[PDB]
Design a binder for this molecule. Structure first.
Ligand code: HEM
Length: 152
């Protein structure tokens, strides 16, 4: 898992996201959708977005971005003791939304990219290392739930 120092780094970085949750959420989803078009097809409510301009102008996409990052933030603040928060998320994404773990890898990478894009020179090597470990823990624990369900 993460050391106490690493968790402190993760939550310090997260402070940046909380200053503009909607903005960060929107950019993460847009990065995901534009870099991996197949992911957009998983959202019946966003598949109508044919261009990045339409994505950028979608208030509902920003709304979902807020929902996504608020959920992730709650999980991160548990510093690994997130079973109750993570299990339901893993089950809904596997059984209901049918999200392959690969897409969770994609969105994890998108978060790292967006942090650098919005905070160039202010997302240090140590910070990236800590956030990466937190996102991997998140992804790996979801993966365990996916295996339980036999979901691919
Ligand atoms: C940072 C990782 C993610 C988090 C924290 C997250 C969180 C959430 C939350 C809180 C909801 C609403 C409640 C629910 O249905 O469980 C949701 C819905 C959904 N998520 Fe995710 N999600 C993540 C990644 C993804 C990825 C990678 C995809 C597919 C590319 C995805 C697709 C969906 C869909 C299709 C819905 C239903 C949307 C609707 O209301 O129509 N999610 N997600």
């Amino acid at each position: 898992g993460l050391s106490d120092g690493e968790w402190q780094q993760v939550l310090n970085v997260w402070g940046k996201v909380e200053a503009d949750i909607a903005g960060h959420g929107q950019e993460v989803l847009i990065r995901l959708f534009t870099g991996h078009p197949e992911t957009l097809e998983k959202f019946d409510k966003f598949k109508h977005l044919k261009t990045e301009a339409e994505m950028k102008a979608s208030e509902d996409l920003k709304k979902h971005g807020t929902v996504v990052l608020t959920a992730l933030g709650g999980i991160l603040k548990k510093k690994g003791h997130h079973e109750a928060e993570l299990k339901p998320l893993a089950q809904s994404h596997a059984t209901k939304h049918k999200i392959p773990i690969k897409y969770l890898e994609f969105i994890s990478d998108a978060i790292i990219h967006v942090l650098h894009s919005k905070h160039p020179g202010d997302f240090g090597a140590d910070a990236q290392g800590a956030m990466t470990k937190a996102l991997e823990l998140f992804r790996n624990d979801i993966a365990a739930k996916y295996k339980e369900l036999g979901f691919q």
